[PDB]
Design a protein around this ligand. Sequence first.
Ligand SMILES: NC(=[NH2+])c1ccc(N)cc1
Ligand SMILES: [Zn+2]
Length: 223
Amino acid sequence: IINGEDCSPHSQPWQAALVMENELFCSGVLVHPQWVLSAAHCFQNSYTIGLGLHSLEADQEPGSQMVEASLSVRHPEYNRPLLANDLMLIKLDESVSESDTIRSISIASQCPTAGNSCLVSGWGLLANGRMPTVLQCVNVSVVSEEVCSKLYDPLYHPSMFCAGGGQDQKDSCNGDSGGPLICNGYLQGLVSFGKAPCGQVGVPGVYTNLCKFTEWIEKTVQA
Ligand SMILES: NC(=[NH2+])c1ccc(N)cc1
Ligand SMILES: [Zn+2]
């Protein structure tokens, strides 16, 4: 997250983290007590999801569950077109509790609207160059489908939407992938990609257009 701040301790209780060896590579979103939503390019044969964590310290977090899983469904249309349909559903090895630091969120019912101020959180690279210690928070608004489609032509696809790109250089970055983008208390999208370096004036970051997969996500979970 570039030019963000420290989220209020557990202000985003749906936020999830994907960890490999000793590091952290992606984030996710708890959209169901047994299902985590993330970005397809974060695929892994097996996962280790950290929930209810303001900091990546399971010890400093009394209320946090480091669950695991292995079943993950990538969208059939991922990367076709290139970078398109970037979303994936990870099924937890076990349900989770419904606590005050771990809560599932609902997926945006309607689609993005330009200028609509939203919020994105994650543990990716900071405004400077490093890894943060606690979840970062930054606010970015949605860009008209016109500006977005033109700015990223031909990579732009209906399964994506831009946000940010303002002169406040607020944007996402490596490590924030899969992170959640909330608008009006709803999960509008997920961190997908964007031109590097991050935080370029006029170059908003692209996210997954979840409103265009509401039917698929449901269908996939109920089977
Ligand atoms: N928002 C961005 N510029 C971005 C998002 C994801 C990513 N992997 C790299 C850059
Ligand atoms: Zn805490």
